[PDB]
Amino acid sequence: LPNVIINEKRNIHAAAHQVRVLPYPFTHHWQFERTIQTPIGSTWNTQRAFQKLTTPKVVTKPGHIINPIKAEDV
Amino acid sequence: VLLHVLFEHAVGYALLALKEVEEISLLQPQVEESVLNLGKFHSIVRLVAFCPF
Amino acid sequence: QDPFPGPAPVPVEVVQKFCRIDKSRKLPHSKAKTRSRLEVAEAEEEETSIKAARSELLLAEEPGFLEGEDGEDTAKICQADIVEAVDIASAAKHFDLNLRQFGPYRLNYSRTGRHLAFGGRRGHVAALDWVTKKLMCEINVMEAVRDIRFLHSEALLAVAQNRWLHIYDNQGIELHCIRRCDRVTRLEFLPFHFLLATASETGFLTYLDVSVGKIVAALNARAGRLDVMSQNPYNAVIHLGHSNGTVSLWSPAMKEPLAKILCHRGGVRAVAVDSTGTYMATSGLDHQLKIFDLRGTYQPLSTRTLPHGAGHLAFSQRGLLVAGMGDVVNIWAGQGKASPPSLEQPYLTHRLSGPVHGLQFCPFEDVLGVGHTGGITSMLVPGAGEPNFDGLESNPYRSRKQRQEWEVKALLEKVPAELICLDPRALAEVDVISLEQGKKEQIERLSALDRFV
Amino acid sequence: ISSVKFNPIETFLLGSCASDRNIVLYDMRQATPLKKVILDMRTNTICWNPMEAFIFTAANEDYNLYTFDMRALDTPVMVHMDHVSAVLDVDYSPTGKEFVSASFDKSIRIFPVDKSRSREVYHTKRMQHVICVKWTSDSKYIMCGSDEMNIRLWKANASEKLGVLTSREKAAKDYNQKLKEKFQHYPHIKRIARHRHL
RNA sequence: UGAGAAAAGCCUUCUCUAGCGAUC
């Protein structure tokens, strides 16, 4: 930078909110950073894009008895 | 919990089908709205047959 | 035998706009457990971007335009020629209020383009809907007024009086008199943080949280009198102009400026940045208009010498730049597709009754607001306003119930002051220095007589 | 022999626990035991996974829970270490992804099958020495039996709304769940989420 | 109690219920 001076001091208050550890199963911090980039709210995505992003993993009917698996539905 | 209910009225007999319901907590302050509110009641109950007199 | 078998394609440029991954990174991964997560992340990103590409057809409006014929220059085209050639709806938006008995006026548009508030030097304060010709309030504080700004919705407005800072309702009822902020010259509001920034004559920059009502920061610039101030909407940082020729970047967390950029050989008197946060426009006493690239380079992209001095600068949502020199305003236009505005030749010109004291573009309309000694004028600027607005963020045609639902959502979503940095995505990157501190703790737990000498 | 359990999948199999700190697998059709594995301490109760035929969880007295694959019984799949007293009873959800354990200390915990730490813990002054816990059949409630002559009912999720929901309520609930797992590694999120008063 | 007290006409901000909407 020809005439620009950049403050090299770190913002400690902002650094408190950042993630300290590198989560499993990630070896490099570049790998973990990629997953968090995509936003998920309905403000930034269409309604059908929002629905596929918020798909629940387990769906249960409220009143039906759940039986164990039986030979791939026999 | 899918089952059929037979309701007898002065006008005739009605057969209805129940899709789903929270059975254990039904007699509780929050879940009771499921049957009280007409819109929520239509969600879980349908009229499959009606035979008037 | 189907001539075109494949599904409908989507434009690559449009998809690239709805993209937030860094493909340039060449990280190596040799583990399948790492690989499965990465491919899903790309799969999630690609499908969301495709859906937004199809939604481009849902957009219904088109930006305005103005091009001459038979070699005529658009600079010499006057406002009267435009008004007769445009529909009756837009023609009603051009008007010239004449209030010379009071001093020169400073004007501010609300974030929604429906409402306008202005303040006079002699102390005339009025707020009005400007689309319809109705007056919300019109009061005369006995003390002098230097600046006027809106606070989030149109309900609250802040005036920078001679002694202290005052807060008023949209109907003219005085609410707060803030004595900490004294001799304030300039006011400007950060919308998504609910912070109001004040520049004072004594040289102090103060941040006030309007949501809670407490002062979060008070910083001493140590640069003398402060009179030139602006914010970057993308960056949320505050720009300060000084007589040295340097512009300082400020955040509420730090007690020292983020960066200093030398831009002029003399004192700087104006600064403005675009909505995207890419380009920076400054003017100075050396009669030079400069455009800087804020995306890591900080070099002057364009330079032009001016006969008079550009007191004020502003940027629209489509990238048009207007400079106010004395009693004459000049607008420079460029294609704007990944390019700065072209300073080769201006787009439109207009002469005011008096010297210019304030400029701002209406958010979602093709009009320009000018405040001067004679009064307030509204120009017609075809192609300056962004056509398609979002109904859930800033709806001009919103009811009272819609407005109050939005305000709670914004209050639930307020950003803390300390998160402001030069990078709005700084929260995403892993704290590298905190990594190695953790790794250190992890490691911790895991010839014959020469012998007689 | 303390307990015996039939396997809900391939229903001819059996599991057993005895007083020599061993677990014995039987076979009803061929009328012979299959294999024996000895641990450090006695296992109080055994429970079969209702969605995985070859997986079972043993409640052991060394403050721990052991998840086993019966084909490869040399080493346990996972170890659960959040209890501080002898574990008495366990039971699986029919979804097969979680189980609830009773212990000698006056608390009950819920563990994910793939995690080694408990998701939540329930406690009360009036409840002492939980003897038995059974997970209800619709994956929504917890019932526990204690020695103070009372049986208590608990909720599977402490913040779910049981009644019929509208479209906006369901959309909001799904958005909240995806938000929590997206930002699960941030320190402030971890600080609030993992705090259980004891 | 002490922007005294009392009465009329206009805007601003907001509170309660009651139907109605969730059945594809």
Q: What is the 3-state secondary structure (H, E, C) of C170-217?
A: CCCCEEEEECCCCCEEEEEEECCCCEEEEEECCCEEEEEECCCCEEEE
Amino acid residing at B17: A
Using a CB-CB cut-off of 8 Å, the residues of chain A touching B1 are: 61-64
What does DSSP assign to residue C303? Answer: E
Using a CB-CB cut-off of 8 Å, the residues of chain C touching A32 are: 430
Which residues, including other chains, have CB under 8 Å from residue D89's CB and lie 6 or more apart?
D44, D45, D59, D101, D102, D130, D131, D132, D133
**C160 and C145 Cβ atoms separated by less than 8 Å:** yes
Q: How far apart are CA D38 and CA D23, in angstroms?
A: 6
Q: Classify C47 as helix, strand or coil.
A: helix
Using a CB-CB cut-off of 8 Å, the residues of chain D touching A70 are: 9
Q: How far apart are CA C168 and CA C175, in angstroms?
A: 5
**Quick check: C44 and A53 CB within 8 A?**
yes
Residue among C403, C409, C408 at smallest CA distance from C115: C403
> Closest nucleotide to residue D169 (Cα to C1')?
E22
What does DSSP assign to residue D72? Answer: B
Structure token digits, residue D26: 């039987």
Taking each continuous run of H as one helix and of E as one strand, the counts in chain B are: 2, 3
* Neighbour tally for D177: CB within 10 Å: 14
* Neighbour tally for C321: CB within 10 Å: 26
Taking the CA of residue D156 and the nearest CA in chain A, the distance in Å comes to 13
Residue among D36, D73, D76, D35 at smallest CA distance from D59: D76
Taking the CA of residue A17 and the nearest CA in chain D, the distance in Å comes to 7
CA C350 distance to own-chain centroid = 24
**C118 and C148 Cβ atoms separated by less than 8 Å:** yes
Chain E bases closer than 7 A to any CB of the protein: 11-14, 20-24
**Beta bridge mates, D17:** D3, D23
Cα distance from N-terminal residue to C-terminal residue, chain D: 35
CA C121 distance to own-chain centroid = 25
Most D CBs within 10 Å: which of A42, A44, A58, A64, as the mutation test of the D interface?
A58
Residue among D68, D157, A45 at smallest CA distance from C51: A45
Q: How far apart are CA C131 and CA D18, in angstroms?
A: 86
Residue among C328, C358, C309 at smallest CA distance from C147: C358
Residue C152 φ/ψ region, left for φ over 0, alpha for ψ in the -120 to 50 degree band, beta for the rest? left
Residues D170, C393, C413, CA angle at the centre, nearest 5°? 65
**Radius of gyration over alpha carbons of chain A, in Å?**
23
* Neighbour tally for C41: CB within 10 Å: 17
- Among chain D residues, the shortest Cα distance to A64 is held by D138
Inter-CA distances, C51 with C45, C389, C453, D182, Å: 10, 19, 84, 21
Structure token digits, residue C136: 């919300």
Residue among D27, D74, D24, D67 at smallest CA distance from D48: D67
Resolution in A: 3.6
Inter-CA distances, D3 with D25, D71, D87, Å: 12, 21, 14
Q: Which residue is nearest to nucleotide E12 (CA to C1')?
A: C171
Structure token digits, residue C428: 């995403």
Residue C437 phi/psi, 5-degree rounding, is -65, -40
Taking the CA of residue D139 and the nearest CA in chain A, the distance in Å comes to 8
**Beta bridge mates, C324:** C312, C329
Q: How far apart are CA C321 and CA C331, in angstroms?
A: 6
The alpha carbon dihedral of C416, C419, C420, C423 has a sign of negative
Amino acid residing at C367: V
Strand order in the sheet with B45-52: B3-8, B12-18, B45-52
DSSP string, C324-375: EETTEEEEE----SSSPPP-SS-SEEEE-SS-EEEEEE-TTSSEEEEEESSE
Q: Would you say the C-beta of C303 is within 7 Å of strand E? A: no
Which residues, including other chains, have CB under 8 Å from residue C140's CB and lie 6 or more apart?
C123, C124, C125
Which residues in chain A (44-63) have CB-CB distances under 8 A to chain C? 45-46, 48-49, 52-53
Inter-CA distances, C317 with B37, C117, C152, C366, Å: 48, 20, 19, 10
Parallel, antiparallel, or unpaired: how do β-strands C246-250 and C238-241 relate? antiparallel
Q: Would you say the C-beta of C98 is within 7 Å of strand E? A: no
C444 burial via Cβ count (<10 Å: 0-12, 13-18, 19+): exposed
